[PDB]
Amino acid sequence: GYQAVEGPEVESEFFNFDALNIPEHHPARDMWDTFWLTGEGFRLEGPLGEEVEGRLLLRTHTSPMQVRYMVAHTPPFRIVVPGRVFRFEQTDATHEAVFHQLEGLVVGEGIAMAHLKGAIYELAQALFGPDSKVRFQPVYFPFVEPGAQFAVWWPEGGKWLELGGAGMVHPKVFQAVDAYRERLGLPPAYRGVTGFAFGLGVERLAMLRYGIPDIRYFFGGRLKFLEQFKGVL
């Protein structure tokens, strides 16, 4: 029951950092190497077509969409957000500056962690298994508490794969949302509701799945490579 929706590759420092509990001068902002932009006459659209402000940059992850969606909608719901993200990093055999992530968010009264757990578990089964399983370890994220990182059991290759992070949507995120909504004239919708969200690296999985060895291969427009996946379905 998850519905797919996309966001903008060029975002505002507000949606990318501020909205999600990410501080300016503290250690958190320092986990994402961002690309800052410049230029005039560029119009960035907010969740309701309004014009928004903030230093421009390249979405560092797909989480900002979490916000735009909530500001623009009403719980309960289940969404999933694919999208290309950008990080300032040196491109090697397993690291890129340009790649894709898949964000997931499910908000509604009653949501708990067990739901997230089942969510991910179903995903595992769907990918490998039913002889596969899931691993959930606590980890830290400014926009979720509890926060966690999850690995998946690959019966074939026999190893644990760290897939992505997830957790229970942070209260200050919900706060942010409602606050911006009212500033936009809308009534608050996220008081008294719960939610979990997750995000995973796509390239990694694609590589493990379709058996690719170099992550650089994806943005390397070589045909001999691309064609290899002609009949994948």
Next chain:
Amino acid sequence: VDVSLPGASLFSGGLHPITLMERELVEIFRALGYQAVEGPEVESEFFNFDALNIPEHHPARDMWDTFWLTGEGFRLEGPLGEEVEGRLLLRTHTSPMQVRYMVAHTPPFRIVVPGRVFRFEQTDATHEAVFHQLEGLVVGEGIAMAHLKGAIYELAQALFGPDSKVRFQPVYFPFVEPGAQFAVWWPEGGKWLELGGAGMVHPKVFQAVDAYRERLGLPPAYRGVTGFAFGLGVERLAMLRYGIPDIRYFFGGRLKFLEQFKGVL
């Protein structure tokens, strides 16, 4: 060069409206976790009638005008690849699949079964002998009618609405008690559409399943579980949806017709 000129005559394909409708309906139920699976067009009187509480010489068998078959060397396969017996015929509805699936699997589950069915009838503007249905079955401990109700309700919303709604009236079917017929609210055209029948899987059906399973060596799996199933006419809906006027139109291989649905998606 004159660019406004026509390019190389390349073939632009299309899909049959039933396929489109089928697809659409399927994508809908898929979002509720239903999985699509098909059955055989040629069935055994056992799966078509007997398995579902349908008697031989009583008024029930008399609600489906069946096509009986004949011929030898034809091998009909049972749910487990075994050979089964019974007078051959053309599936009169997709319900038989309900059984084959249960015999072959374990609850809990949600399935949906598209498929072409056959009924001996005179072909007119709104009646065919060959058409399609979409069966739905959800078995598991705890299942109740409210689930069916929500199921159908979600379907309505998915098709029209959220300004649309559902109507559930009691009706009689040998393989479900309670039995019911359901209509859907079409906000646009403003009328009630009788869509299909549904109900809580009948106990004797579950009984049948387990009985055949054991006869096949398998342990019983449907004792202490509940379930609901439903089935709806596809052509009707496709006609209302894509705005077609003659049901005969579907099996009438006319191109001018078929192409009309080229870009439907």
Next chain:
Amino acid sequence: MRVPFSWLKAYVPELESPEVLEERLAGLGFETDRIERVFPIPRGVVFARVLEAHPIPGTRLKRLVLDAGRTVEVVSGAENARKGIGVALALPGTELPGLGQKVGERVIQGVRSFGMALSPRELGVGEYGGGLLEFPEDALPPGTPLSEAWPEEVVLDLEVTPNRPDALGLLGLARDLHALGYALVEPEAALKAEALPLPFALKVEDPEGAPHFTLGYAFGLRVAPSPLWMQRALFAAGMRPINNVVDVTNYVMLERAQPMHAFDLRFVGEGIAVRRAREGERLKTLDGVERTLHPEDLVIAGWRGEESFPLGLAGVMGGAESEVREDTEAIALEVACFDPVSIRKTARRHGLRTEASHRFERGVDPLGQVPAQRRALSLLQALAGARVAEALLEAGSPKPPEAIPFRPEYANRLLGTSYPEAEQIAILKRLGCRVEGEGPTYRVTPPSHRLDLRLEEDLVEEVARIQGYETIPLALPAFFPAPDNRGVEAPYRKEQRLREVLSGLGFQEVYTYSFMDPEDARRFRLDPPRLLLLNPLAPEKAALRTHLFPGLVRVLKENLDLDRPERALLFEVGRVFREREETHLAGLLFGEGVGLPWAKERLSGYFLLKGYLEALFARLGLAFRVEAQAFPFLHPGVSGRVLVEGEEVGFLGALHPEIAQELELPPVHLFELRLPLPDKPLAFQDPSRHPAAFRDLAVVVPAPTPYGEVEALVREAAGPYLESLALFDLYQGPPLPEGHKSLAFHLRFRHPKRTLRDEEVEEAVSRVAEALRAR
């Protein structure tokens, strides 16, 4: 952060083993990136004490006389080498990590060296190698193999998230394991302090940067090498022992996440002043680097009369001068809490990242200063036999944390679990929280060293990790989604169906970087990028693609250079950036074209690309057509704008040759559109059974005139019964006006309800011919 099993075990005695530990930590929120064994010391190396150190005349070497059980000599070049210290002596026959060559008895310079004393680098306990390991002269009975007092160790390379600054201290972690049910052993700081007054003063001129500041006073110090166990732990922690006093400040900094520095009183003068630096102030830092200060830099200075001089860089690194050496007998101890942001700024402002800087940036326990001072002074009294004053110099009274409201029921509600209230409290309490209240909502005040604990939720994450994330059950939610979420998928879905059709039509999909080389704005005749990077990956990816096709073409090239594909047809959907972010779709064709491989002819070029384009729309149920249009990047004559269902979006054409050649490339064909494509909701329409009216017809018009207008007119005049309208042929033509052309137009007509009476056919036919060239 390095984590030496044995050291941590000193607070958590009941640890089962490094592996079990790796387990336990993973669960508390700490992932181990590596595990290592570390102090293998062959039987050959033993403890020896330097009775005498005689220099060899004419050389920069010394002959050391050692007590290693029996007396013995070695020759050393190490500067720190001198009488009165204990040293690591590898006897002849010993196999060392570094040298594959066994240790022996070599004659060095008139003297036969029996083995050799070792540097940390040589023994393999550290990286140093620029001097001998120095030990308390009396650490062991001369000769005893070192391994006897220096056992191998196991170190865990841990990952401490920024939300757990208290974990930059081994004692912080111990506290967590304790929460799991392990026994915790806090180190007791025994101290015999004296009444006397502190011979210096403290003045905090910048309280914003130094919220909390303390000073300790120790004198009558016997500065000497640190005891083995300490050297061992420090070395294992990846830190290098200097002397007992300095070593102590480090040990404690690693114990509790509290950095501290000892300043030789010799250089303090009248007192310590915590203040910002005066423009251009100079300071030779500890690392022997001479530096100049910026006025934002907080600093620890002293003063003599009317003299104020910098002593160390507040919370980052101390001055080289004030540092503690052998001849020091009294010092002042810096133990404070600095403002993270200033440290962050100042720290990165110069090329530095120290253990101290790191901790202060992540945050220090606002109230850990004093207990930390007691801990350090106690250690000093013990290891340097320090005399310590009972009083401290304090500056700034910080506030304690507040109670956090906590509902056990809510906790469970949130996790989807069913833990009994008591179990929860017990946990929080084991974590050092105070819990008041009778229920159902409680008053929970966290320990000050815990900065990540502010909300009720933070509190829940705790019960969770301590109970174990694996103890949370599995479930699935069920609900009818708010109505405004209904249609949502459409856009995405639309884009994908399209994506799919293409691949099925014959296009290879491609993925291109969203970056752009500002230079290509020229290379390809197009306007400049509106968005630029402030930290580009490279000057050739300093802008944001405004167009898709440039990248495609570019790909074409590089493909040709790697593998030589005869033809190529592909597309790519991506986001381009102009005044607004936009979803674009472009496709490129090149090569011989299609047809029989063996047989001569092919059919390709522009009209091929169009062929496909038209079929695509045929498949999407959209009306598309093209009209010549001048495009800076497209060869003219072979240029044209694109009209999807009655709209203008994108273009199509042959790549302008000037560019074709500016690049080692031959002829290519393009097109780039804007998405989403508009859509025509189908209006079904009954086709009639009554046979159509067929016609043969041709038009003669100027060679310049576009097919368009032609079809347009003919079509607009055909009448309401025109079923079909096609073009089966045309040629310039000898038999007609030099500047005109012929047009083979096949025509069809039909009437729904009845058959078409010829009266209306050859009639409406004129309706056209009339206004046909009547125009």
